[PDB]
Design a protein around this nucleic acid. Structure first.
Ligand code: ZN
Lengths: 102, 78, 97, 83, 95, 93, 101, 97, 83
DNA sequence: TCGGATGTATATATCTGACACGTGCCTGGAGACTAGGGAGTAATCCCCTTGGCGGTTAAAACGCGGGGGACAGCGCGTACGTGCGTTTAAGCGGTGCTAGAGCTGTCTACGACCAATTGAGCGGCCTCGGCACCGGGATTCTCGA
DNA sequence: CGAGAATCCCGGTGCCGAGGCCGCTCAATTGGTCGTAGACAGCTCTAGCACCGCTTAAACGCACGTACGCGCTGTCCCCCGCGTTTTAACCGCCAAGGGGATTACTCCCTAGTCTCCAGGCACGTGTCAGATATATACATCCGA
């Protein structure tokens, strides 16, 4: 396949179909699916690595929405990227103002 | 109805937010802001459903309405 | 015995920030949503998943607003939140005119 | 010496970098084989990209604890590789 | 029964490659799917906008590269463009 | 080359409403930008609705819902009234 | 009448908006009454803004509308202010306002 | 002789500057600054005077809005003088970084 | 010619006029540095976007269209300079 | 509590350039045809939403007591507004130059459309362990001392 | 420094969601052609950069002195924590039919194509609304 042609894990065929079906442009080049699949794959790898790290720190063997929330809101540029997204069952980070403490 | 949102629930929301001490009028103010927010969201969702020729408001329409309002929500096949 | 005021408050604060379940009870919220939708068009039907999504969104928005009011209140050298704080926070966000 | 030489280029480990998979590599060779090429462990294929990002941000790639031990035990080998 | 498609198997593949000893909940797969779709939408939409803007009717690798550079913040965007250029040169090496 | 603009059209409207008032170049350009802004907003909303509803063409209902979603209450009401009057006129004659 | 604009009794060109929609990749196909609807809405909006611009111009005793008059119009109209709540108008200025304290 | 008390000249100035619309920051210094900032990123860029003017427009609008919010916060704090803490609160509540 | 310390061209009387238009009455002494910093970061972002647009266009001149379109990307649309 | 002076507003002239109009020309708009797919409509099935009723049970509501927090008055000391004198550089305006934006011809490699072929991927069925829940002990704290 | 509960750390059971395997059809692959969007070369003129000088408006620095930020104190009353009583949310369970989803059918609305032509385009030209400078008349704000 084209995925094995470049060593990626994401579907070159699916993303090529979606670019056409979305009516984004009259014609679509060949390197576009490969590039877009690569960037999506790397981003998901980042998210999964951080979520798994947080989950293992919490001492569990599965990722849950709370682990995803910890991972995203704990990292600076990822918080910037998903600054407008609310995660279901995510909760909030433990943070108390210094003066409010006894 | 609108007073169904009770004051221990409002207190729990404030406690989760990090608030330590609350006053008396906070309850009515919070009821007002929540009413406004719900009004807007259900208006948009109902418009979508009316366009779709359906009598059932679906979570996908609510996700679209929240996307319109710039409050994107994950976890419902979005 | 009695704890001094504020310590049980912060204990609850920690307990609730450690949790992840929803706080508003389902039946009153569903009745509220049905009443609101009744004004606009008659005899609508709702998905339970749609009601849950609305609950999620309202939960998050209220939590964020309360964070902002706490910041304004502590800036005002007070420790108690007040309606003027919420009003000013909404104005600065730009929601209220 | 055998434990103190990375298994890829066989030279003595200079500025060793210990990946979270407990493996270790020598530096000019770490960035030659990993940092700019694959972003994965040469033996267990573990992805390391965010690890390297965070460490390059905080300049903690080189294990100091092992580096001091290596310099104390084989300073001549370290100097010969550096030259 | 509608044949809805999903990214679940490939997300699972990436997780297997990165963290071998870990599992996933169906809820979590839902958020991962939504996140992938959202990023795809943003990139495709801005790239289409750019292609319309430069009075050119084809969307290419240069368009998506500029897309990544405008959307993602600095460090990650550098990493993404490196990954993408590696992938495209590897693909065009073979036919 | 040619630089398309809605100048004569805005001038027609302004002459229709206020017979004794002219327009400056800066204001004319501002109005030209505003029309294009609302144009892209409405068109994008209609396209999203059409794609979501699994439909291959946009029409009067699509633009009607787009105007209803975009403009606030009374403006949208008067706009939809104007639109239906105009389309009724066009289809009748 | 030949022209669609005269057919519908509108000032904005149905043919122009038809061409623009066709060259916009908004849909695979486009309808017939859609350009007419869009032109009517656009014309109503321009008429609406010109109402207030002209009234402000008369208030300032001027014969020509300018960006300051446009800014005053937009920011005095409540609804249009919500429509254009995130728009900067060149040379617009700020409404005269002093807060109480 | 004569000296106006503090405040009256301030009100006079604010009404003067709210009546008019001309630009305030000086154009040659602004052009120098923007050219330097550009030189930071990529070498050898030339600029349209219209581009410089547009950048000045946007910067003016943004700073005036920021000062309005800062004044609101300072008034909320029962003060008359604004301070960097007020500026920081304005930016934080807006959600900028 | 090399440019340096141009951020100081933003004079304190100019800062004062901006605040006077904004409605401020009494002005502190430390806010000049803060205003300079916020203006710096805002210009950094808008210039970044405009330069990238021009780079993709394969040109050597930054245009009003590019600046306007960057400001539209940031969600701060501006009227009166085309488009 | 009048009075000076200084800012504002008012009035008037005038000269200029920006706006309005005439005019002529070419690309976009209008009319006519076709044929082909997409939406309209009827019908059918079954799934999900609504409604009712009750049982234990934790949550909500009410009262009360008091102590910590908000708000007002006061006093002190300094930082910023205001005025003036001096210094600096921005603004206006000619001149000169060339580098790069913009337009156009030619040719061509690259992508849309079409037909054949197959296997990755999705709906379904299965099975079993990670963590929800829970009863017993340590601690890590809060409050009185 | 003392007690003393709230919470943290811990061993056991067990059960519902996760992980694995199945198999078939629709989307991916492959091969091929044709045409046009796109790459490359060539020429050419608006404009961005650089300069110089004169002028004058604006920026700096200084002084002064008074209004406001800040810490302190006191007082009164409004939430917080606890104990007790009332209530309806939550779960399980059974009934019912309205409407979402799917399939088939058919007619009509629109992309694509070609032929005509006039409303919209640039270009040239004339003149009156308004910026500027300047002369005048009042509001008012603070010193006396
Ligand atoms: Zn390894």
């Amino acid at each position: 396949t084209r995925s094995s042609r470049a060593g990626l894990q994401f579907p070159v065929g699916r993303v090529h179909r979606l670019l056409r079906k979305g009516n984004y442009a009259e014609r679509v080049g060949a390197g576009a699916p490969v590039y877009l699949a690569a960037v999506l794959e790397y981003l998901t790898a980042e998210i999964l690595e951080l979520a798994g790290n947080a989950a293992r720190d919490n001492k569990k063997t599965r990722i849950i929405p709370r682990h995803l929330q910890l991972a995203v809101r704990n990292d600076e540029e990822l918080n910037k990227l998903l600054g407008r997204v609310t995660i279901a069952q995510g909760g909030v980070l433990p943070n108390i103002q210094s003066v409010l403490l006894p | 109805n609108i007073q169904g949102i009770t004051k221990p629930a409002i207190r729990r929301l404030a406690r989760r937010g990090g608030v330590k001490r609350i006053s008396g009028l906070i309850y009515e103010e919070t009821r007002g802001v929540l009413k406004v927010f719900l009004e807007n969201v259900i208006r948009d969702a109902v418009t979508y459903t009316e366009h779709a020729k359906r009598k059932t408001v679906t979570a996908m329409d609510v996700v679209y309405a929240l996307k319109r309002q710039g409050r994107t929500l994950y976890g419902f096949g979005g | 015995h009695r704890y001094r005021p504020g310590t049980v408050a912060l204990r609850e604060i920690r307990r609730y920030q450690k949790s992840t379940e929803l706080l508003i009870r389902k039946l009153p919220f569903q009745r509220l949503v049905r009443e609101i939708a009744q004004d606009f068009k008659t005899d609508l039907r709702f998905q339970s998943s749609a009601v849950m999504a609305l609950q999620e969104a309202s939960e998050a928005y209220l939590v964020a607003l309360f964070e902002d009011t706490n910041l304004c209140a502590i800036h005002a050298k007070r420790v108690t939140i007040m309606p003027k704080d919420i009003q000013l926070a909404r104005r600065i966000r730009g929601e209220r005119a | 010496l055998s434990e103190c030489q990375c298994g890829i280029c066989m030279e003595i480990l200079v500025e060793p970098v210990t990946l979270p998979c407990n493996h270790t590599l020598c530096k000019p060779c770490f960035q030659s084989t990993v940092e700019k090429a694959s972003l994965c462990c040469p033996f267990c294929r573990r992805r390391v990209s965010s690890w390297t990002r965070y460490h390059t941000r905080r300049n903690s790639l080189v294990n100091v604890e092992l580096w001091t031990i290596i310099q104390k035990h084989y300073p001549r080998e370290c100097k010969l590789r550096a030259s | 029964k509608t044949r809805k498609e999903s990214y679940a198997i490939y997300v699972y593949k990436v997780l297997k490659q990165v963290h071998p000893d870990t599992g996933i909940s169906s809820k979590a797969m839902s958020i991962m799917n939504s996140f992938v779709n959202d990023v795809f939408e943003r990139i495709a939409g801005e790239a289409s906008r750019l292609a319309h803007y430069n009075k050119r009717s084809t969307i290419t690798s240069r368009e998506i590269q500029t897309a990544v550079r405008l959307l993602l913040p600095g460090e990650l965007a550098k990493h993404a463009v490196s990954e993408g250029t590696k992938a495209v040169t590897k693909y065009t090496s073979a036919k």
